[PDB]
Design goal:
The structure is a homodimer. Chain A has 2 domains: 94 residues, Helix Hairpins, CATH 6.10.140; 125 residues, Tetratricopeptide repeat domain (Serine Threonine Protein Phosphatase 5, Tetratricopeptide repeat). Chain A contains 11 helices and no strands.
Chain lengths: 226, 225
């Protein structure tokens, strides 16, 4: 539907309003804690300076003990206090009407097809180079969904975009070796052994003991030879 | 001992260091969260302008789903994260060498003793006008006295607490409770003129205080008698 998307756009907006509320909360806590800490900073720096004289006049001694017995306990209680209940409460509730895995993969598939029905370069989708933009792990996931479909066409394309972006300098949760594993395997399944070999060799240049890739190399030079 | 307190002073110095670290931790986390939030502030606002055209080109639909299914739960996980174990472990360990309630009460008594062995005015001990206590500190000392049945000191420190309140100090402690204790201590001391006086002012602040009405009637009774 479209109304569903407008409904989810709106949910996620309200959720951002909630989030920002929570941020006001944690800042307000954190600050009065900073205030508290500077107060003790002042006290504890002047007290370290002259422990005999400080502990001398017992207005200091009483303050020191009311502070260690009571104050540091309130303080501790406040550090432990939780500011996020409200926001998390909301989120837990909204999550009743969120998409699940099924819908995420559905949406990947949909993207996959709309790539080649309007016939588009993956750098031309990722980078919004047409008249929002895609992390390396996004491309990576697309390559995976594809690979699970044994769709090596798309696996090739997105694993390639994913490799391209990591090279370009995008810092990520995803490493080159996985990218190269899936890339080299999709390529091999395509028919072009010749590139599979080199890619595998890049993987090996990154991970010399990648147990799968060595076996892959042996296999490769074997089926080329034969 | 003196060295024992030197060890304590240093311990608390250390704890302040720990806490300051904790603050750096929560701030760092919060920052990453504000970051995430602003990125989504953009996305949501763009999307609301024209939901149709937006969910039109389905990279938008994909990201919207990935973000509702995966990413908001990582965000959730960040929100729930606890930056405090380091500091709280430090605290829970040091606590083994902290004073307890009895030590604190004890110190309050040591202070009451000092007040009079050097014969010193309360504003003067509080305001460190020698060559500083909050109103709740003052009240506290007052109570320790009271519990002792030391109505002398109860008198004095309830007086100082009321003094520091009227000056305009913000405190968790209200004027009426200080007045209750003060009126009563004064009465037990003997100056009944002042007990009446005070009870009256307490009533000026709370007109239906159940103890202090009967306190008014009873005081003027024993005055007249």
């Amino acid at each position: 539907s479209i109304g569903q998307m407008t409904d989810l756009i709106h949910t996620e907006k309200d959720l951002v309003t909630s989030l920002k509320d929570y941020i006001k909360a944690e800042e307000d806590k954190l600050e009065q804690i900073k205030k508290w800490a500077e107060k003790l900073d002042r006290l504890t720096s002047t007290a370290t300076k002259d422990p005999e004289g400080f502990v001398g006049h017992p207005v200091n001694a009483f303050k020191l003990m009311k502070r260690l017995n009571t104050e540091w306990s309130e303080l501790e209680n406040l550090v432990l206090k939780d500011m996020s209940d409200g926001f998390i409460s909301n989120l837990t509730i909204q999550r009743q009407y969120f998409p699940n895995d099924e819908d995420q993969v559905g949406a990947a598939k949909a993207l996959l097809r709309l790539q080649d029905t309007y016939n588009l370069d993956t750098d031309t989708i990722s980078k919004g180079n047409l008249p929002s933009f895609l992390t390396a792990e996004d491309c990576f996931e697309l390559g995976k969904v594809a690979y699970t479909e044994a769709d090596y066409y798309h696996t090739e394309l997105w694993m390639e975009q994913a490799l391209r972006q990591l090279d370009e300098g995008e810092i990520s949760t995803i490493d080159k070796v996985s990218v190269l594993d899936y890339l080299s395997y999709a390529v091999y399944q395509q028919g072009d052994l010749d590139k599979a070999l080199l890619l595998t060799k890049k993987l090996l240049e990154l991970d010399p003991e990648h147990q799968r890739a060595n076996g892959n190399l042996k296999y490769f030079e074997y089926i080329m030879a034969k």
